Structure 1
Amino acid sequence: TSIMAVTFKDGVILGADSRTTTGAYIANRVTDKLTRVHDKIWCCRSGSAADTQAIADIVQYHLELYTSQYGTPSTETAASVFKELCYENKDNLTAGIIVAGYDDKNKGEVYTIPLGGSVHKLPYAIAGSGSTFIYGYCDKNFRENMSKEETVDFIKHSLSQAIKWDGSSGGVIRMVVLTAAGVERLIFYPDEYEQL
């Protein structure tokens, strides 16, 4: 699995591959790992598919109920609900989640939640088995306040390399753009990103 979320001038973009594996067999080659927990709060999922689905579903329920009572929740609040589940059930879970969202007040924010259930707010985050191969590339090429087009190219190039080297990663590159304008879904196929 190769997932990442990157903040930029106009908001935040989430990115992911589409491969689900049972050992070396690809159980699903068109998986959607970019998941919606609120209108403009999404997450990237890595680890157990059952665990991360169950968590995201519970979070979506919590934020729907939050909204009914207190109005639109912050991205930090959403990350806290994820954390609470991942931390308190750490013994029985295998879930590496990146939380990303857009406020008008706070703009684009990214929170990463690794295995232990700790929380880390970052300008950008990478995770999944394939992220190991792009720590060098991403550190060297990331800049703050990039444009939408620059950020899309950054994620496209980064996940391209992660897919190239990681067997657990592959398929299409899915992306989700979170800005004031709304929510845009993007997709990039092998013939496009392999030749980079």
Structure 2
Amino acid sequence: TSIMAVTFKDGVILGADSRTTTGAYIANRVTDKLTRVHDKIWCCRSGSAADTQAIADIVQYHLELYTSQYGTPSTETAASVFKELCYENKDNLTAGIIVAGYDDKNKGEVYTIPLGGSVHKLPYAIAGSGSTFIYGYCDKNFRENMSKEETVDFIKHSLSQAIKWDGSSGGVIRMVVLTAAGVERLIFYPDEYEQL
């Protein structure tokens, strides 16, 4: 896994590779790691595929029941529900999740939940095995209040490098854009991002 989420002027964008690995064998080369827990609250998954799928399904259930009673939940609330599951079951889980969402009051927000189950609100976040190779690049190239096109380029270039150096990462680059306008899915193929 190479995953990231980046806030920008109009909201937030999530990005991910598509490789799933059992050892050196690529068990799935077209995986969808960008997961919907609510209309405009999505997450990026890393770690055990079983664990992160189980957690995401439970969170989706919690937020569906929240919505029926109290209306649309905040991104902070979604992050809290993720944290509660990750913290209380830390002994039995291997999950690293980035939560990204768009409110109209709060706009774009990003929360990262590493292995221990702690929460950290950030302007942008990177995670997964491939993230190690782009700490330098992302820190040098991230700016606040970028445009949609600039943020797409930043994520495309960042994950391109993560894929280039991390054997566990690869395939297509997927993105999900979260703004007031709605939800837009993007996909970028190897022939595009490898020549960057």
Sequence identity, in percent? 100
Aligned pairs for 1:49-60 within 5 A: 49-60=49-60
TM superposition shift of 1:187: 0.2
Query: Which ranges of structure 2 fall in alignment gaps of 5 or more residues?
Result: none
Look up the SS of the partner of 1:116 in the other structure: coil
Look up the SS of the partner of 2:45 in the other structure: strand
Counterpart Cα distance in 1 of 2:192 and 2:115: 33
Per-residue CA deviations over 1:148-178 (Å, capped at 9, x if unaligned) read: 0000000000000000000000000000000
Look up the SS of the partner of 1:91 in the other structure: coil
TM superposition shift of 1:96: 0.3
Residue number in structure 2 paired with 1:106: 106
TM-score by length of 2: 1.00
Per-residue CA deviations over 1:83-117 (Å, capped at 9, x if unaligned) read: 00000000000000000000000000000000000
Counterpart Cα distance in 2 of 1:158 and 1:26: 22
Greater than 3 Å deviation, 4+ residue runs: none
| Number of aligned positions between the proteins | 196
TM superposition shift of 1:52: 0.1
Query: Which ranges of structure 1 fall in alignment gaps of 5 or more residues?
Result: none
Counterpart Cα distance in 1 of 2:115 and 2:27: 23
RMSD over aligned Cα, in angstroms? Answer: 0.2
TM superposition shift of 1:23: 0.4
Counterpart Cα distance in 1 of 2:159 and 2:186: 14
Counterpart Cα distance in 1 of 2:46 and 2:174: 14
TM-score by length of 1: 1.00
Counterpart Cα distance in 1 of 2:94 and 2:164: 24
TM superposition shift of 1:190: 0.1
Counterpart Cα distance in 2 of 1:48 and 1:172: 20
Counterpart Cα distance in 2 of 1:113 and 1:127: 10
Per-residue CA deviations over 1:103-134 (Å, capped at 9, x if unaligned) read: 00000000000000000000000000000000
TM superposition shift of 1:81: 0.1
TM superposition shift of 1:146: 0.1
Residue number in structure 1 paired with 2:178: 178
TM superposition shift of 1:70: 0.2
